[PDB]
Amino acid sequence: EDLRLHLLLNTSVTCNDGSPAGYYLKESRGSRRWLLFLEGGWYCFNRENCDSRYDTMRRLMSSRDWPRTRTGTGILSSQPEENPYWWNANMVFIPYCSSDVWSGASSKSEKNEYAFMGALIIQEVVRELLGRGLSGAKVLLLAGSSAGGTGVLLNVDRVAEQLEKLGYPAIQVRGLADSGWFLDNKQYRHTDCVDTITCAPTEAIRRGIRYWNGVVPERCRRQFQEGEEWNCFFGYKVYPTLRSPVFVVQWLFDEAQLTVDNVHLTGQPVQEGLRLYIQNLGRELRHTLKDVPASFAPACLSHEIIIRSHWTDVQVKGTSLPRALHCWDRSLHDTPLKGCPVHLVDSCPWPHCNPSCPTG
């Protein structure tokens, strides 16, 4: 009940169906910390699959049925028992209603059945919050899970630039990308992109960018250039182009990654081909995080962590995620810290080799 809905006052910034986008807010009068969380929820990339999403996932495409309040959980909780890290922060939950991995900049019109405005929704939320206390902030942490985690990578630097051009260069913009660090790897079984379920992420995102009028960070765009902006949706490719500090949270054996790799576990014995596939996926993920100084990557088969009520339970090398985020805060005061690590990547090679992995 802690977060209260506000629909955007700028009615031109809309969910997929043209209804107003919005945000849920719980203010903390004492605090100059602001947490803006980007909800996840896959994406759609053509008329037919967006139509189907509108039938059975309408809250991800429309505000018409949104409730007036939401309960803050995990990193959005205001109870220190549940949220050791930022329980006293101003809390913002931004519903994902643009189906575009937070990248879109296109309105519904005579040529567009749907609006894809994810990148504009974030900018408009930031603008409207500045009159609600964000103008006094010292840190704005843009966080997100799954498609919202990818959205952090695509938008954190644009939020920084926006605040600079609005006259607030003192607000420190940082990112926390959870479960949004995907690999454009070989699938375990492969299909040509002939419909929605057969379309590999690289091809689905390439089509999505054109359907959404998707935008990516400027430095990444200049590296990959026209026709190749889909590359900037892959964390290991976009991360090195970013200037804002970003903490990366990623399960080594993410269930969404395995799904897009056409791996479906049943509990039956894993044979050698699939064993090597899974072990190689964990090794590749670990490799992409080698030069990411702020990261938390447990060897578990799971998906998302930061808004889960029991997010405090998982540890890597004996350090929980709330502790690692606290150590990250200390490291950004402006040399490593004794017993306060920020780079926590498991080295064991199979899901649940870490005993603190979520049970399910």
Ligand SMILES: Cc1ccccc1OCC(=O)Nc1ccc2[nH]nnc2c1
């Ligand atoms: C794949 C990919 C590559 C680069 C960037 C984003 C991305 O995808 C975002 C997402 O949200 N994906 C997703 C997949 C499978 C899922 N199963 N359940 N939720 C799921 C979400």
Ligand SMILES: *[C@@H]1O[C@H](CO)[C@@H](O)[C@H](O)[C@H]1NC(C)=O
């Ligand atoms: C409303 O949003 C649109 C799209 O982002 C933007 O072009 C316009 O300037 C905004 N209007 C105001 C008053 O902020």
